[PDB]
Symmetry: D2
Subunit: 303 residues, 4 copies
């Protein structure tokens, strides 16, 4: 069943002894392969087999859904894991938050552990939120895939803006829009986006829904965009918001609100980027790539 | 595989000896059950088994996709079947066709044969188009499901407006929006709508894309609506256009262009309906239900 | 100077012995003519002569500006007269007031006195506000011309919604749009509307700006409409809102939010009108014509 | 009458022996003062006295309307002067001309004569149109004030795009928006814009209506903008189009279609400007300042 985009799930509802064969932890960390750069099953990579499901980060190593996860990270597989009053609107073409203009001093954060790997632990969440807030960061973007549910609770208790990311991105396929302009791949992206929205709609920290890093002009992506819009009218969806890819250009995306989903790779041009953010009303900020390495003072001074 | 909405198709690409067991023609017509009121497989009801598919009118008798076909017709199953210059826009809230206001003197037509049943034959198409044009009918709506491809060729050679209908309707489920507000059913509706749009985008006779008769407020329906919009920007999509259900009210759908997808059941109130069509700019016409029985002069005089 | 629309005012800034010759009170009440059905000069009819001005209800009997006052009333002339937190928007095509849908149980009120005439007295204001509130009236429309400034203070202290009316209406000219599609009359309407907006922008009771009863398709009217919009973005302007003239039709104005600026002349059809108001979301209410005669229990029960 | 903005005209309908006193030609050219840098009266500067009028370029030297003519030119006064099928729209935020994207290779042209001065002669029009077309110029902007009517006929016979400019600009008043946010000056700007629109609506060469060079945020300007829009729906109005003032920034006006009404003063940065025009879809071109001095090969190569 892990070869056809049509077969998305089987008997999947709404949102340990191990053995390895040729055909919360990672089995590539204990060593079984070479890493390459109502029961609930949160954080299962690729496909697994009561029912079947291939929606990862929402057991086989390769699956049909792996083509929609063309993000830059380490490739493991296995079992990874186990209300407020605010308004965010796009009135008058400006990102308004509770009546005041919103400035996004955000940073992209990966779900990474130095020892375990992609598995997440609670203490790291604390020393990450504290480090972010101490360095003038007011927003965090859960890079590529949604984070652990406890992260959103910590963010909305400590007061941190969260931009939720759907696990949909094709940076390796040529062209990139091959899998997003094809109706055959619409069910997989729908199952990826709708479950994330259902899981994370009740978090005041979540302020922006993100479809993907970037995969094409649209067609399938925007379908989920305003599926979120009509399903969750309170939060804007970005892909309302245009998100350039490492814009140097800013002219091109302006001449088509703007939030730099990926900018200032880690940090040249930071001063010009933040001068642009402060001056230009529709340049409401961006997210620094990335928070942690996949193995700071300048950002604090700039923000 | 015919029990889960997630399993839509298997190895299905883009768009005779028979044996009956307890578990182009209809096997219920020769008599095997009680009717109830690259190879290409056009017109296969329910699910069938190289690959698998349950998208009917786009072999088992009951399937998972039968819940989306809650239309009023005879229930058979089996194998049923084997460019112009015009602009239609919604500029200024009015349905414009080539710069002139569009008046829809349409009628709903079923794919029905007195002897064969739901199987379609070519001569009937001719004596139906001729009868429609002789009775001042300028539009035809392919009721419930898309019609045979030759119908669109005959319509665009003889000059008849066609409103394409996607096979999606829930008139029996309580509430009706149960299957349209549930993300679990989005892949099936997507596979139903996208294949129809891919098959019938290259017909000048097709002027309006219709999502369904009526099934709920939206959520899943509108996703396909503007998936068509962004995939086929030339034609409007109706469900741009509001389509009342047998409006008596017209006030309610006005106070939310309007085309009566179902009106004047066959014919009381026809004079008032057509006076409303002639006077009111946004009441651009409707479709008479139905063209043929499922076993005329007044319409000719009114239009 | 009282013959040319171009001459609007002279030395006019931003907002008693009498003698009669052939060429706060009314000189037609004491008897001098036949009635026909920084210093501040509030309520001076027609034109008068330091400077010159012809903007009445914002001394000659006939003037150039009298053509824009083709309302139904008694024709006198002379000297007639001497902050809250709420949001009103048209989000999603619905009249929203502080987040809740707004129902207008309003009545049209004239500035009339049984003895003095068009002169206004303070006690009458009190026994009018009390009578309106006791009869389930929550809104008042200052018919034709703006009312005395103390009226708005009484309304926003007692909590009564006010729709401000600009003194612009041509119900006698054939066609009515003769004076509104002619650019020669734009300065007069601009001077009429801008001064009213400047005078009454700081009243929380004022919730809707009204251009005129009805005078034509637009051209000059809508100019003032969104001059108010860009000058006072907080309040909607009606003429955002469509105001039918004594609609019986409601179909025609729906098929073009709706508030009946003139309906239920005093009272047939009141039950149907209020059933329409309660059922139909975009029919948000209306104003009863009129509050007082120019010489009640049913309205209380209906609202 | 030449001191009050309210007095715009007297008895003015819709669109030689000389003596000098202390209180088609220019009287400052023959020498009477120091230049400073149904009858029809076309091109009369300031105010003049049957009737009165102060709308110049649509006899006293200084008038009330001179405050709205704060453009850069020589100050003279006196008597200066005596259908096609195309669609221009702003569909999808892009300037569309007959279905194709519009690139404006325009230049700003003054109504200037080396000997006469601001008086215009027919031959100069010919050697100006020919020189413009030979140097890859496809558009011309009538700087500050509308040009002689024969210019539009020559342009639409020779096929040259024309952007009509209303004589409204305050570059000397501090702040500039003093005269455009004040309702007292609305009648003068209305009389200036409406007469130009009435005079030049029937020219296929005219494709864009321009309110002014730049005078403020709006208030009074936009009123005329969509007075033109509702009076002449065929042509866009710019001030639909954002026109930066000598943008170096382009970021700021993008982050608020764009046409550079004033750019490349005569020529540094021309290569970058035209690279921006070619690459960026919403940067549809600009106008070179100026065509002629008020006493070329690089532009030809760049366009």
């Amino acid at each position: 069943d892990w070869e056809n985009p049509g077969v998305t799930q089987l008997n999947r509802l709404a949102a340990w002894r191990f053995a390895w064969f040729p055909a919360p932890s990672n089995w590539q960390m204990h060593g079984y392969d070479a890493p390459i750069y109502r029961i609930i099953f949160d954080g299962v990579n690729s496909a697994f087999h009561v029912g079947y499901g291939q929606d990862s980060r929402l057991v086989l190593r390769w699956s049909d859904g792996s083509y929609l996860e063309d993000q830059d990270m380490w490739r493991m597989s296995g079992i990874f894991r186990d209300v407020g009053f605010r308004v965010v609107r796009i009135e008058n073409g400006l990102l308004l938050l509770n009546g005041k203009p919103l400035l996004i001093r955000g940073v992209n954060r990966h779900e990474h552990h130095p020892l375990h790997g992609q598995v997440m632990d609670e203490q790291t969440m604390v020393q990450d939120i504290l480090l972010m807030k101490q360095n003038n960061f007011n927003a965090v973007r859960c890079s590529h895939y949604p984070n652990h549910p406890l992260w959103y609770t910590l963010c909305d208790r400590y007061g941190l803006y969260v931009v939720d990311e759907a696990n949909i991105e094709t940076h390796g396929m040529v062209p990139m829009n091959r899998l997003t302009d094809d109706p055959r791949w619409l069910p997989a992206m729908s199952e990826r986006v709708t479950r994330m929205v259902q899981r994370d709609r009740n978090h005041p920290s979540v302020i922006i829904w993100s479809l993907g890093n970037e995969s094409g002009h649209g067609a399938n992506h925007d379908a989920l965009y305003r599926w979120i819009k009509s399903v969750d009218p309170s939060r804007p969806v970005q892909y309302d918001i245009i998100c350039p890819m490492y814009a140097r250009s800013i002219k091109k995306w302006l001449s088509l609100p703007l939030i730099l989903c990926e900018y200032a790779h880690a940090l040249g041009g930071f001063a010009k980027y933040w001068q642009a953010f402060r001056q230009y009303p529709r340049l409401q900020g961006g997210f620094v790539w990335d928070w942690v390495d996949q193995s700071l003072t300048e950002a604090k001074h700039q923000q």
